Amino acid sequence: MVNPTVFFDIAVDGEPLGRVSFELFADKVPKTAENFRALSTGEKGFGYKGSCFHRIIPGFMCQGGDFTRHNGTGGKSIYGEKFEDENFILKHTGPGILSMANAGPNTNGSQFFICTAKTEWLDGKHVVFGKVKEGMNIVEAMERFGSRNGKTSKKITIADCGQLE
């Protein structure tokens, strides 16, 4: 076995920006990695394709994954609405870490964030499950559209996504 690689094609107000691919650490957090992988292929009949990054704060992170309400309040996992914090083995060590957003202990759904800096205050509270493999320059380009309070100036969407490996 090998860790799955999934990709997102990002568009800015409908114009293609580029592809970011991610390695998911299924060897360390199998349940959390599987949730993100199945939401990226859309194989359960719902997922990330066509959803947006609703909150981007330059120097911190890009947050997305609300494919139900689309405004930052929704999303659901493939296990039902929410699931537990699988473990906190991995930390938020630098740019490119993929981690889960939540509303406290054991509330993981589908929303996630890509870190653009080390965010150690989130360690032990948000489950790290992947990292950017290629396309960190597209994540950096995305940051230019965010703001200190998180609203974006352009609509940043996942135009397409799926599994490569």
């Binding site: 992170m61 930052g72 999303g75 509303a103 989130l122 948000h126």
Partner: peptide, 11 residues
């Protein structure tokens, strides 16, 4: 501040 939540986003 700098949190990443779903529901009540804080400062």
């Amino acid at each position: 501040x700098l949190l990443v939540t779903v529901g009540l986003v804080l400062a």
